Amino acid sequence: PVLTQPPSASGPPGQSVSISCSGSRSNIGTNFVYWYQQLPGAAPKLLIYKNDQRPSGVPERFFGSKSGTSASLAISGLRSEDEVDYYCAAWDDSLSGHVFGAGTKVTVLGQPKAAPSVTLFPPSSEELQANKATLVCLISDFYPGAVTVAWKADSSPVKAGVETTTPSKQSNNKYAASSYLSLTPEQWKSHRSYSCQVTHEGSTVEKTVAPTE
Template sequence: MQFSVLTCLLVCLLFSGSAQFRDHQYKQMSVSEGSSTMLGCFVEGEEIQDPAVQWFKQLPGSVPTYIQYHENGSSVHWANPSLQRFHSISNSRNAQFLEIKNVSTEDSALYWCLQANQSIHPVWGDGIYLSVYGGKNVQAPSVFLMSSQESSEASNLPHVACLVTDFYPSVIEVTWKLDGQTAPGDFIAGPFQSEEDNTYSMINILDLSSHPRNNFSSVLCEVRHDSSRTHVTKDFSDCHRDT
């Protein structure tokens, strides 16, 4: 019954609109398996009096799952007893933390905070990626570059794709560099989990023809997988010569 009440509270908060405040979370953290860590949630703007905070965990392709609810100065309510190693800590009225004890590889995910009280609308954080390294089941990614046509010149390529396969856990960062300048991908699919071995794969496609300047001498795909301590850079021209 208690969890049902909390679920109803969450639904009410989600439909109550936006706020004049903004929750800020660091973009990413990396910690070793078996250690403890704390994820922060900081409100920018006016101080929230007696805030209530909720925490959520999200894996690729899934909706955020509820971890716990903590009302300032009150008890903590978990979604289920197995989550009691997740502890909510209030440092001030504008700073909330989620302490995770004895972290494991499976804790690698995107974490969201949600703060509110009776006088303001709920304020979502912008999410923080947690990567856990040192686990026996961690697998480093394999990285491949592909193009829409055969050419040794990057300026002649309409599209290039960066295929990243066989990595675990799912938290990963893939970015493009055009002559040293960071460029976002135009189409990203994944990460998708394999049913055979539970590893993940994803693809990031860059449309070079859409850029005002398309005569790039260097097209790089950079892949960062903190759980396996892997940082791979693939240059399209090098890959073309290798093939």
């Protein structure tokens, strides 16, 4: 048996939300359910233990309960400046080991899109003198994330190890992503025009450079 959790929690601020952790008959009900939360880039911390008492260090803000197969963790609204992922833990006698949930990250609920800016950097001659050539293009100044970057030689797209890095959230309220592509100098100089396209879920721009300067 594998314990399941939603990938993310959709919770708007100003009104109460909660999460559920469904299990099994030998996992939930006969044993207590513990909830854990971790800060982004830091250590976790227990939230509710034994389903009715709470640790010292948290105000009267959270509530947790267990009812049969699933256990609910009632939350009094949501703070926009404090968003953490939640965990669900229990015990199974047949597995004889602690089982942890998938992890539910609470997300707030609408902002308009922005205008992305794309740049493309051709390799320098010092890279080409080592019998190698790599191409990288970057996307920035866009909100929100979840973008896909693909290469194009203005005649047909090329797939020679194309990867798409996951977007990362910065501190200036802006999402960023990049794509890398490494080739050989024979194929790099075969095409005199290279570009990459970005997908802003409705917006697409092209950054065309030349392999001269």
